[PDB]
Design a protein around this ligand. Structure first.
Ligand SMILES: [Cl-]
Ligand SMILES: [Cl-]
Ligand SMILES: [Cl-]
Ligand SMILES: [Cl-]
Ligand SMILES: [Cl-]
Ligand SMILES: [Cl-]
Ligand SMILES: [Cl-]
Ligand SMILES: [Cl-]
Ligand code: NA
Length: 129
């Protein structure tokens, strides 16, 4: 599924991501925008052989099992395929663990490079939330 901007903001809020670990909803929408263009089916292979999955491009290196990332962990205890669902629950639950891991949303390099310190409120502006 390709989410609308306000549609995704509303799902993220429903799943308790708005201000999770102090990160406003705008931050999560911004990160999803640049990670996946809001497309739940986004996959991208990394140079190291790991793969990023879903709206927030969660990496098989640590967070999900895809059976093809040697020496990797599955800290969210999910198949990476669960992260491609039109239902964002698994992505949201796993992102909660990732953002709690010590570096906050810096875990998402695109968030650091494209969202951090910007007017992230723009990403939820006009949305009925
Ligand atoms: Cl947009
Ligand atoms: Cl915001
Ligand atoms: Cl596993
Ligand atoms: Cl693996
Ligand atoms: Cl593991
Ligand atoms: Cl699995
Ligand atoms: Cl959903
Ligand atoms: Cl933080
Ligand atoms: Na893995």
């Amino acid at each position: 599924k390709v989410f609308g901007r306000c549609e995704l903001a509303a799902a993220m809020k429903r799943h308790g991501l708005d201000n999770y670990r102090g990160y406003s909803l705008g931050n999560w929408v911004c990160a999803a925008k640049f990670e996946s263009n809001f497309n739940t089916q986004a996959t991208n292979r990394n140079t190291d052989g790991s793969t990023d999955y879903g709206i927030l491009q969660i990496n098989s290196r640590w967070w999900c099992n895809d059976g093809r990332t040697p020496g990797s962990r599955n800290l969210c205890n999910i198949p990476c395929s669960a992260l491609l669902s039109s239902d964002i629950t698994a992505s949201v639950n796993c992102a909660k663990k990732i953002v709690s891991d010590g570096n906050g949303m810096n875990a998402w390099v695109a968030w650091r490079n494209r969202c951090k310190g910007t007017d992230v409120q723009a990403w939820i502006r006009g949305c009925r939330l």
